[PDB]
């Protein structure tokens, strides 16, 4: 039913561009304004980076947002094509200062396999 995260994956094909895009619940009860987001591959852990972002006009309470990134897909190595190990993950910006139990609530992330075949014979 229309997941928080849907990427552009209309045809499958590794080396193709794709668009993040992540809904954003605007909560508490008040019309809330300068509401960025940043999107980053990889882990927090060991150290991600931003690819982009976009600050929308204004979100409407009770309502969400929806911001459009693109970026290029790449992870190839020519072996054990047999698993993505691409994953996708979004952090909204901290409307708490510091806080991880409630951002840890806004947390989103789904993997996705890549098809990689070509027609035989001819």
Do not use: C
């Amino acid at each position: 039913m229309d997941l928080p995260i849907t990427l552009s994956k209309e045809t499958p094909f590794e080396g193709e561009e794709i668009t993040v895009s992540a809904r954003v619940t605007n909560r508490g009860a008040a019309e809330a304004h300068n509401v960025p987001v940043a999107v980053y591959l990889g882990n927090p852990a060991q150290g991600g980076v931003e690819i982009g972002r976009d600050t929308i006009s204004r979100i409407p309470v009770g309502g969400t947002g929806l911001a459009r990134v693109q970026w290029k897909a790449t992870r190839k190595l020519a072996g054990r094509a047999a698993n993505p190990g691409v994953p996708v993950y979004a952090v909204v910006d901290p409307d708490n200062r510091v806080a991880e139990s409630d951002k840890a609530n806004n947390v989103f992330s789904r993997i996705v396999k890549v098809l990689e075949h070509h027609h035989h014979h001819h």
